[PDB]
Design a protein around this nucleic acid. Sequence first.
RNA 1: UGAAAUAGAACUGAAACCGUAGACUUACAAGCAGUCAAAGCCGUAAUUUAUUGCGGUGAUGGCGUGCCUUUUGCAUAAUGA
RNA 2: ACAUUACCGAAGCUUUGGAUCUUAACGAAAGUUAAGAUGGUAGGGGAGCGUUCUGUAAGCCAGAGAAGUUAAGCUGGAAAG
Lengths: 59, 145, 115, 49, 103, 114, 100
Amino acid sequence: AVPKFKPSKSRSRTRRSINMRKKIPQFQECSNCGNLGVRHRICLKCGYYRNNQYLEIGL
Amino acid sequence: NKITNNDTIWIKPKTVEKKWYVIDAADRILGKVAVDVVKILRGKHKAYYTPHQDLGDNVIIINASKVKLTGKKYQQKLYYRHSRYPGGLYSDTFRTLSERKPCAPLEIAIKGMLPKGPLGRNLFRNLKVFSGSEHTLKAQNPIKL
Amino acid sequence: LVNRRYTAKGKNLPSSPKKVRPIADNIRGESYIKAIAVLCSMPNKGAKLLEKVVKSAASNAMYHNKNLSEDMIFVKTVMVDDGRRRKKIWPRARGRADRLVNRNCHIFVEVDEKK
Amino acid sequence: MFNLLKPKGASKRRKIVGRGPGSGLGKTSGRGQKGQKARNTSPRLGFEG
Amino acid sequence: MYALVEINGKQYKAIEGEFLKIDKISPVEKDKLEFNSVLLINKDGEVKIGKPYVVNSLIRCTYKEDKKDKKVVSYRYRRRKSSERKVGHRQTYSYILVDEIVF
Amino acid sequence: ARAKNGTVHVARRKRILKKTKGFWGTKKSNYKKAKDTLRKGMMYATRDRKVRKRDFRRLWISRISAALSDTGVTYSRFIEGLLKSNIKINRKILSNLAIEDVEAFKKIVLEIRR
Amino acid sequence: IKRKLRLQLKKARFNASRSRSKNKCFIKRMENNRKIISKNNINVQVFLVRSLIGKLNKKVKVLKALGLNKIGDKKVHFLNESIKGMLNETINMILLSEVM
RNA sequence: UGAAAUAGAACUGAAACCGUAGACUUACAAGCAGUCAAAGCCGUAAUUUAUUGCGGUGAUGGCGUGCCUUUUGCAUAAUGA
RNA sequence: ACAUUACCGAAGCUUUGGAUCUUAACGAAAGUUAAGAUGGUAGGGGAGCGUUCUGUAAGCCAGAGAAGUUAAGCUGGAAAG
Ligand SMILES: [Zn+2]
């Protein structure tokens, strides 16, 4: 239940690069402000979404 | 100044131009046919033969279903294989193997006699075996042997 | 190689380089707008740290080159090195103690005018 | 510069031992393999075992 | 045109205007060399083969220089015996420019 | 009289690492693995320097045997006639000849068959 | 397969795998050597053709008394009873030619 | 400001270790990872100029049971890092 | 199985250089040639490399760039320079 020999840097690098990989979220520019917002989410900059106000963005 | 190299000569494989040789196997003996094929494939008939690289020609075998054997081999020679599962050892006599795959005996023999490794596998890629007396590589004008 | 007029550097930031490098990979070579959007969206500590450094680098470039707006800039290079470490103790059973390393990272971003 | 010019053979060097394989006096350093003698000792008293 | 010639018991393929690297030759013979043991001559199509030497066929050369090769190292060591030996070496070679092949 | 100055071990290690440049993995930078691989490599170098002679002579023989496959002279018989007719040309030379100028080698063979 | 039997078998096969052509060459050499030794009071040249490694101690001593230490050793000797006895002892490792 | 600001809370800053960029190679392959041969590609220098060298990578072929202790004998699945 | 003529095949032998040692001869010595002899654990003998410090040194080389690290190239039979 313990490593038998230290793995090679190749194997460690391969495993690390494959696992620690985060995927980009999709985007779609807001119809109101033109910001690039996450697709299917309220715009975090102007608050509109499909031409409807839902937030009141502060500071 | 220039020096006359008195060293062994190596010919660049991009200046060697591979031909195709037709070999008939009718009424010949399996081992002899395979030996001839291996000698041609390996490049051992050219003055600049080299085991490093692939410099020999290609071979088309026709009439592969008419190779003759001697002795009781037709009834007794066994071709084994293992599925890697436990107990999964399957044998196949020459008769049955020939009927199911007419080209199998000669392909197996040539594969055994060729060298081993990436170049050996490539050499076996350089070989075409046909059961009948006709082949589809008419576009290459193969030289008969 | 660096046009050190156009770059930002953030030293000893509170995250591990192993955790910040993938986020850097996702924005290397992208346009500034796309990279800023990605870093704002993605909810990672490394994402926020890169956001600050990238915004600062773009600010420096703009300040020194007044005719360069937010949409001619692309993130040319991004480097994430490892920084100081601090060791603290995590005590376990039977009087056994283990040392519990905390890693920091350096972040270097250079922007450049787009193709 | 006047080069004292020592007479030859006037000072042997030493038998520095245990300083490498190439010197011929390597790991075991002239003592042999094991036993009482390999570890500093020999029963002195004109001993015959 | 070329010659297959033996020098000090080593074959070489001599061509006119063209250097040969051979084993070091004595300082005494650093002036002008004549070699009389020609094994084969190919002249513009037709070839004469000696038994063992083609008669009335010489090669005349001018000594040029001596030159050392790259350094090689002979190393050996005995496993778990703590013993080894290392020796350097550089072989020396002489360069001779072939003038004419008396054919 | 303390005699410490450690400008020696770094020197040994730098020479070893200089000679072990292209090796795979950790054998190119670590001192211990580089020294082990280098030492076995140099012994291989000696052995193989002696083996290269055998390898090249074997290659020459195979090339000669290939160049003779055309005619009906098995090259054991070819060496036979070669010695018997007192032609002291070399395996390397014949192998190279069969490539550079095939017709000269063929003429030699016609001459041997006597 | 039992180790006793396989060792015996491997040794027997190695022993039996000798070539009759080589044996005939050796027989011819032995006949030539005996013919030469049968002479008396001639100068004979002795070549050493088999190594000293692994041979009997007595025979190594005889060969070093003849003057041969390596293969390829050349020594001329005058055949009298002493040299004849030494040659007979070590006949299988020498090649005798005659010095006209 | 200073001679130096990769002297800015620290001289010189090596190796282990972590990266970025470029060159070549790698998804039919069984490599104590090195050595001996060796095409292609890249860099450079000569000979007027596509062939030789020095370099770096390297398809492919031959060979190859880490090292140190202790042993009649260790690749040993004996010890030690 | 028995005959004829061969070939391949090792670091063995021969050939081609180069190094050391011993003996013998030549030579005023120095050295030059003739012969053989140089696998090696335990162990014995001999010759060197490198490090620090002191005298030589109130010398010599350094702010026109010293030690130290780093890159390339080169040299010696090895340490190494
Ligand atoms: Zn919006």
